[PDB]
């Protein structure tokens, strides 16, 4: 639930779209096993798709360890320092491809509840409403029931 | 004593048809030697054993029955087989500069 979970506001990393778009994913690390059915899909992904992904994403350094700890994994490191570890255990080639593309597309910001679907640093152009907008002024600034 | 292990890598020789027809003449003659039938066990054994000794690469038992003709033997022997591990097959495949593969086995 929202009340039992942290939240944040919609944001980019370094104003990621103002001047130029910088892909926030910078490192992928596939720990894959030579043997073991758990990493069969990872092995097929390394054989058939990792090269094409690498040449599609020149800004991402991709490592293939070929000796994992525990389950086969992909560790995605982002520019803002975020590290997201995704197990690729028993996933098919297409499942791993979609997961890796999702990691490439997303930023390093936490996948938690986002309070507002929008973020403006300049919410007002004509001036934020205050009680004295739309209130007429009076001669000599006389408040109500003032004698002079 | 165990001899050095025979590498399974095999590149078909350039003068393969000439060598094969020489061996066929040695074993068995008519025109279109490609279509000589190997239904005879003696002749098939002689031809295939000679080829295996010469080229260091024998027809496996699985493919042994489909060698019905010298044409089939030629087709089997003109297809390369490489024994390089998947590590080599990937590393020596023009990896993009941002892709790094390491093997700890």
From Swiss-Prot, chain A:
GO annotation (BP), single: mitochondrial translation
Q: Does the keyword Endoplasmic reticulum apply?
A: no
Give the originating organism: Homo sapiens (Human)
Q: Where in the cell is it found?
A: Mitochondrion
Q: Which family does it belong to?
A: Belongs to the mitochondrion-specific ribosomal protein mL43 family.
Q: Which residues of the full protein are shown?
A: 2 to 149 of 215
What Gene Ontology terms describe what this protein does at the molecular function level?
RNA binding; structural constituent of ribosome
**Which Gene Ontology cellular component annotation is one that this UniProt entry carries?**
mitochondrial inner membrane
Task: Summarize tissue expression.
Answer: High relative levels in skeletal muscle and testis. Lower levels of expression in the heart, brain, placenta, lung, liver, kidney, pancreas, spleen, thymus, prostate, ovary, small intestine, colon and leukocytes. Expression is coregulated with TWNK.
Q: What is this protein called?
A: Large ribosomal subunit protein mL43
Chief subcellular location equals mitochondrion
Keywords associated with the record = Mitochondrion, Ribonucleoprotein, Ribosomal protein, Transit peptide
UniProtKB/Swiss-Prot annotation, chain B:
Query: Key word DNA damage present in the record?
Result: no
Any one GO CC term of this protein is: mitochondrial large ribosomal subunit
What biological process terms from GO does the record include?
A: mitochondrial translation
UniProt keyword list: Mitochondrion, Ribonucleoprotein, Ribosomal protein
Subcellular location(s): the record lists: Mitochondrion
Tell me where it mainly resides.
mitochondrion
Q: Tell me which domain of life the UniProt entry assigns to the organism this sequence originates from.
A: Eukaryota
Q: Which family does it belong to?
A: Belongs to the mitochondrion-specific ribosomal protein mL50 family.
Record text on subunit structure and interactions = Component of the mitochondrial large ribosomal subunit (mt-LSU). Mature mammalian 55S mitochondrial ribosomes consist of a small (28S) and a large (39S) subunit. The 28S small subunit contains a 12S ribosomal RNA (12S mt-rRNA) and 30 different proteins. The 39S large subunit contains a 16S rRNA (16S mt-rRNA), a copy of mitochondrial valine transfer RNA (mt-tRNA(Val)), which plays an integral structural role, and 52 different proteins.
State the name under which the record lists this protein.
Answer: Large ribosomal subunit protein mL50
Residues shown, of full length? 51 to 158 of 158
């Amino acid at each position: 639930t929202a009340r039992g979970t942290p939240s944040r506001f919609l944001a980019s990393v370094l104003h990621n779209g103002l001047g130029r778009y910088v892909q926030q994913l910078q490192r992928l690390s596939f720990s894959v096993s030579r043997d073991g059915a758990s990493s069969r899909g990872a092995r097929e992904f390394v054989e058939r798709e990792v090269i094409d992904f690498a040449r599609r994403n020149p800004g991402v350094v991709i490592y293939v360890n070929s000796r994992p700890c525990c389950v086969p994994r992909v560790v995605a490191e982002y520019l803002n320092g975020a590290v997201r570890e995704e197990s690729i255990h028993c996933k098919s080639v297409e499942e791993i491809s979609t997961l890796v593309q999702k990691l490439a597309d997303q930023s390093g910001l936490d996948v938690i509840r986002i309070r507002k679907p929008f973020h403006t640093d300049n919410p007002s152009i004509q001036g934020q409403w205050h009680p004295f907008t739309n209130k007429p002024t009076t001669f000599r600034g006389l408040r109500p029931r003032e004698v002079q | 004593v165990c001899p050095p292990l025979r590498s399974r890598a095999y590149t078909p020789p350039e003068d393969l048809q000439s060598r094969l027809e020489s061996y066929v003449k040695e074993v068995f003659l008519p025109s279109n030697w490609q279509d000589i039938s190997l239904e005879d066990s003696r002749l098939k054994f002689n031809l295939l054993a000679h080829l295996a000794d010469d080229l260091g690469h024998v027809v496996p038992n699985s493919r042994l029955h489909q060698m019905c003709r010298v044409r089939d033997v030629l087709d089997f022997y003109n297809v390369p087989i490489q024994d390089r591990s998947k590590f080599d097959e990937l590393s020596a495949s023009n990896l993009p500069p941002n892709l790094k593969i390491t093997w700890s086995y």
